[PDB]
Amino acid sequence: SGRPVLNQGVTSAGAPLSIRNNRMTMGLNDGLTLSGNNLAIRLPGNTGLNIQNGGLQFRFNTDQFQIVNNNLTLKTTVFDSINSRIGAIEQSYVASAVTPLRLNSSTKVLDMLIDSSTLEINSSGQLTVRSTSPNLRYPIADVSGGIGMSPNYRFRQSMWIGIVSYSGSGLNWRVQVNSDIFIVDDYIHICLPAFDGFSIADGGDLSLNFVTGLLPPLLTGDTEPAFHNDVVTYGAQTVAIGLSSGGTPQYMSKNLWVEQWQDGVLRLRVEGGGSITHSNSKWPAMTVSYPRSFT
Amino acid sequence: LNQGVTSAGAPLSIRNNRMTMGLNDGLTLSGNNLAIRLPGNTGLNIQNGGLQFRFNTDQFQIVNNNLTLKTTVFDSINSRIGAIEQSYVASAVTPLRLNSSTKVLDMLIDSSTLEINSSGQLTVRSTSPNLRYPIADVSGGIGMSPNYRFRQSMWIGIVSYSGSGLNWRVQVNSDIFIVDDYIHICLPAFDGFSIADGGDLSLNFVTGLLPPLLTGDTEPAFHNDVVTYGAQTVAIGLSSGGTPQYMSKNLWVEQWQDGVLRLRVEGGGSITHSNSKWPAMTVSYPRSFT
Amino acid sequence: PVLNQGVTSAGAPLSIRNNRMTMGLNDGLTLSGNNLAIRLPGNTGLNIQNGGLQFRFNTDQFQIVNNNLTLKTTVFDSINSRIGAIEQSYVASAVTPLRLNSSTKVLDMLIDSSTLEINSSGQLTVRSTSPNLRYPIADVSGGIGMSPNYRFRQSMWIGIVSYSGSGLNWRVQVNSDIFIVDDYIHICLPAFDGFSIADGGDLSLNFVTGLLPPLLTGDTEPAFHNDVVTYGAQTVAIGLSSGGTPQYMSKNLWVEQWQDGVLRLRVEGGGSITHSNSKWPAMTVSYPRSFT
Ligand SMILES: CC(=O)N[C@H]1[C@H]([C@H](O)[C@H](O)CO)O[C@@](O[C@H](CO)[C@@H](O)[C@@H]2O[C@@](O[C@@H]3[C@@H](O)[C@H](O)O[C@H](CO)[C@@H]3O)(C(=O)O)C[C@H](O)[C@H]2NC(C)=O)(C(=O)O)C[C@@H]1O
Ligand SMILES: CC(=O)N[C@H]1[C@H]([C@H](O)[C@H](O)CO)O[C@@](O[C@H](CO)[C@@H](O)[C@@H]2O[C@@](O[C@@H]3[C@@H](O)[C@H](O)O[C@H](CO)[C@@H]3O)(C(=O)O)C[C@H](O)[C@H]2NC(C)=O)(C(=O)O)C[C@@H]1O
């Protein structure tokens, strides 16, 4: 059984085994190396791999990671301090607001909607009711801070400097007088001074022309009666007038009343009592009063 | 003599002078060499001269050769949560009310005093003031009732005279004016019969007043007390058919009793006479109110 | 024959002794049956699978990008949602009258306690307040009305009327009701007998004493104060005699002046006669009264 060449021991090998000069070696890629005389795994640097516990193992932070079914797994305890902080905000916070409350979602700012006329914010940031002036109508008015009665309604004085005219059955004449005027509540008082006139008739008219002669702030319209231009027998009274023709006057008791106001002219009736022939009349001071027009 | 190799220990084996090596999965032939086999891409790689693990350097780092999370992984999440915690609303104090389950903030208000207008604003509820006559609503404000300031009426009734056994009656038509707290009865001129030195004139307001004025509306604020109010002088023409002699008498309001107003007429002397001519006279006095 | 002879030496990790070859192995390499194997003690994420050495990871938490271990972005989805949810609408700051305490996370509101309060029901409410009123406007049985005292007050004067004229001086004790109604005062003198009078003269009412409480002297001052006026001018008939039948003269009376609590009335006109005694009619004196 003679083959020319007799192989003895080992004459060949398969990769990664190789033979050079009758010496056998093993080729090694990166990752495999020699540690002393033994084949070793090479783990350059520090990347989480290490030779420990008898072999190749992967290392990880035992607070952040764990192994479940031989799978790298996040420990749930690494998220917990996040979930409890959020959960602590979810348990109670404001997401929406109802009027008068207003939340601007984009600025995260909360404010309150109020009404200027009724409410105001003071110098302390407090919400407060605005101190409002109540709606009043003369003669009701603001009096030193409160709801009162206007002093101008209670009393007002002025003067009329003007013409008194007598008319009656052809008898004719006029005189100039200065008179105080007092307006008190809903009345006007015209305080005529004593004056001298001429012939009067049994019945006649004494007219006061308020179209001119009223001193500011009074105007003609302020002498209009509350009964306006109706014909009345208002404030009828008895006046004594001295009649004469140069000599000793005879005092006649006459009847006088406010009868009508028309277009600024107050007309007073003067009648009754006796009559005599005479050329002169000595009139007494006479106050004439009546209720005054208002608006 | 033999110097060769005749047997080998695993993982080496020999058949017919040829040696081979047995390899499990994970070890493999790469070109001529033994190599670690790493199928797919699972983070493992042969690099920098050996076996290494590969990790996103934004999320992980290595500390004492352990895989570790970068702290900067959570920086965004911790900053955001901190951005809320540092200042937010978790609770509300009345009248502010927070429902924790719906995250709704609303305000508790009193429906009688406050309200929310169409503008969605908080505004004080308008309240009409409580007013007592003669204070009243005048064209929308607190004013003085026009009716208290001036009221016109009329009396058509009997005036009667009584003095020292002289008696007689007359009918008159008189305007009445009520102005603030006074009443004025404007009697017209009238004729009568004989009068005494002193006597009483009576106005019977029980009948004759124009609706809606009533008898009680003529009651003095001094009610039925006896007074000497509004004393004045009046001239009365006394005659017996001829030319009258005018006597100056003294007249005042003396008492109202049950709708009848009494005026005293006395003084000024006396003559013998059968007829009297009375002037127009206005009678005024403070009027009753409740 | 000519023999091949073969291998006679070897390099680590192979070694030869007495015709036997062995291979030295360090930790991490081990025998698995007759094969060479990677040793992986325990479970640390490493495994032999799919043909070789692989690393294993939770596929919900990690992924492989560029062959680098990486965090799935879906790991942070539950958290990014909740945070965002709060972010899109929450209260960070409050404006007066609202006040947020950034530390206690407590929101309240600042109110003025003089005009506003919190009731029993926890509601916000305006405090009920009485309107501010000025006499003669007053609280009348619950509402805003006209004070009854201003509408009618009654009192009395018990004192001396004095006449003065052309060297004539005399005085007379009288009593009179006083009525104050709205802005007027009325003094109701009774008829009385006096003595000689002149053509013109002054009748004076001394209000310094004799007014009944709660009326005071000052209460009789006219709204025109101490101005000299011709107010309430009227006719009065006065009987003049020397003990016999009086002759009645028509005189002119009016309010002339009030001064230091004494009211003066002018009385003039209508002629005259020699006489020693005067019979005065009842006279009511009225004028607008002073107010504060
Ligand atoms: C993390 C990683 O890269 N994994 C690789 C893996 C790894 O490199 C080795 O296991 C380490 O030793 O190799 C895997 O197979 C690859 C092929 O994709 C190797 O064979 C590798 O790449 C080459 O593969 C050739 C290709 O040239 C040719 O196109 O296709 C044939 C098959 O048809 C071969 O696969 C390559 O891409 O060129 C040749 C190269 O020399 C090889 N490297 C080594 C070190 O031998 C694997 O193990 O499955 C693929 C895996 O993704
Ligand atoms: C990630 C992992 O699985 N690690 C394993 C590890 C790993 O598979 C190898 O290192 C990779 O080559 O192997 C570890 O040891 C085990 C046994 O503890 C291996 O020997 C492995 O186990 C098997 O179980 C055998 C039984 O078949 C036998 O009857 O009894 C023995 C002693 O109890 C074992 O139980 C198995 O899983 O089937 C046999 C199997 O063939 C073995 N695998 C290989 C590749 O030879 C280790 O290294 O310690 C365990 C470690 O968890």
Numbering used by the authors:
A (entry chain B): 161 to 455
B (entry chain A): 166 to 455
C (entry chain C): 164 to 455
What text does the study give?
At the virion five-fold symmetry axes, the trimeric attachment protein, σ1, extends from pentameric turrets formed by the λ2 protein. To enhance an understanding of mechanisms by which viral attachment proteins engage cell-surface glycans, we determined the crystal structure of T3D σ1 in complex with α-2,3-sialyllactose, α-2,6-sialyllactose, and α-2,8-disiallylactose. The structure of σ1 residues 170 to 455 reveals a highly elongated, symmetric trimer that measures about 200 Å in length.
We therefore determined crystal structures of σ1 in complex with α-2,6-sialyllactose and α-2,8-disialyllactose. In each case, only two of the binding sites are occupied, as the third is partially blocked by crystal contacts. The electron density for the α-2,8-disialyllactose complex did not allow us to model the terminal glucose. The α-2,3-sialyllactose and α-2,8-disialyllactose ligands assume an elongated shape in which the lactose groups face away from the protein. Inspection of the α-2,8-disialyllactose complex shows that the N-acetyl group of the second sialic acid forms a hydrogen bond to the side chain of Ser195. The complex with α-2,8-disialyllactose identified a hydrogen bond between the N-acetyl group of the second sialic acid and the side chain of Ser195. However, the results from mutagenesis experiments demonstrate that a Ser195A mutation has no effect on either HA capacity or viral growth.
